């Protein structure tokens, strides 16, 4: 996240971690055994970390719990960007308490303008390299579907929203990957890719989650 | 006047260090360039030039540039390209960047020589640079080509990858 701030501890406890060895990307915990994040975040083995605000320092009341199952989209295509999602399932229910619960999935796609709230751990900086210990949030509206589709021309399809500024310095960036962007308590997007970070007219790109609220669902009572 | 290419912090690249080729784009199509085994390549070393599918798991293979000639590394200069990792003599010259419409990009080639392959850093539409192979404006967009679902770097004059030099 450049450009935004850090969160109030256990504020978002929806957020996750997915370490492979080390943090690398984000996901959202969307019931007590499952969680969505980006296909472009697959890994075959992963190790989910929840409650966590500092992810340097192990403060005693995180929960590590292995993935059972990690299941992409089966139309994700990693060079045309599109269904970049995927769900985690917990080897063990979490534990939910007031740093580790769920978030909502979408009941409407959101309309733009909608301010919603981005967080994560990757990048603070638009060149160089700054990696906070600590969870970072950014607000930020719904662009327009014609602003995005002018920011960057031929690469949207209809599974992606840009969410942030047409104008820079604040946005998503490398490692905030398969985060939540959720929006009237509603998770709307997952952060997917982008082109530098906080450049104008260069918003971050999102999974649209509203578009995969019935494989969800389904995968999730299949699996 | 001579423009020196610069790192991700600002400073110009020196051919004592060592870079990781970054991609502009990040998440999804991130990924930085590493060496890999072509697909049915009869080496015994790695001999392929790829970028992987995204940038949140390994990191690029790193890489030095070998001016033709002075110290410094400046934009439309030629130069060589070698990755910089712990090798055999073998597998030296698979280190080297050479190039074999579509071009794959591989290694195998020479340093300094008539016979080498040059490249040059030019700045790019966008945001970052771009890399041109130079068969010494007759130069050549280095991009990618997905081959056996992998992204290969190649030659396509449409459509270059944007590439940032990030120190290691
Ligand atoms: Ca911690």
Known sequence: ?223 | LPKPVLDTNGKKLNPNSSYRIISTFWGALGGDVYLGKSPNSDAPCPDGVFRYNSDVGPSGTPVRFIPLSGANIFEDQLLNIQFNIPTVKLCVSYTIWKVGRTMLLETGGTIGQADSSYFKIVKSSKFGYNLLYCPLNFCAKVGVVIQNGKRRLALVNENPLDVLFQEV
């Open chain 1, 1 to 223: 996240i450049v450009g935004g701030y850090t969160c109030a501890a256990n504020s978002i406890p929806y957020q996750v971690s997915l370490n492979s060895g080390s943090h690398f990307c984000g996901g959202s915990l969307i019931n007590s055994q499952w969680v969505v994040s980006a296909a472009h975040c697959y890994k075959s083995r992963i190790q989910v970390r929840l409650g966590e605000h500092n992810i340097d320092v192990l403060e005693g009341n995180e929960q590590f719990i292995n993935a059972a199952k990690i299941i992409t989209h089966p139309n994700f295509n990693g060079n045309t960007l599109d269904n970049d999602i995927m769900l985690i399932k917990l080897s063990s229910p979490a534990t939910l308490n007031s740093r580790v619960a769920t978030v909502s999935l979408p009941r409407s796609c959101a309309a733009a303008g909608t301010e919603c709230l981005i967080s994560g751990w990757g990048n603070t900086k638009s060149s160089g390299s700054s990696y906070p210990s600590l969870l970072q949030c950014l607000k930020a509206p719904v662009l327009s579907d014609s602003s995005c589709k002018s920011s960057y021309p031929g690469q949207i399809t209809g599974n992606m929203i840009c969410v942030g500024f047409l104008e820079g310095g604040k946005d998503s960036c490398q490692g905030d990957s398969g985060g939540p962007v959720v929006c009237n308590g509603q998770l709307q997007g997952i952060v997917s890719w982008g082109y530098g970070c906080a450049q104008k007219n260069k918003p971050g790109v999102y999974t649209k989650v509203c578009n995969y609220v019935n494989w969800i669902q389904q995968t999730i009572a299949a699996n």
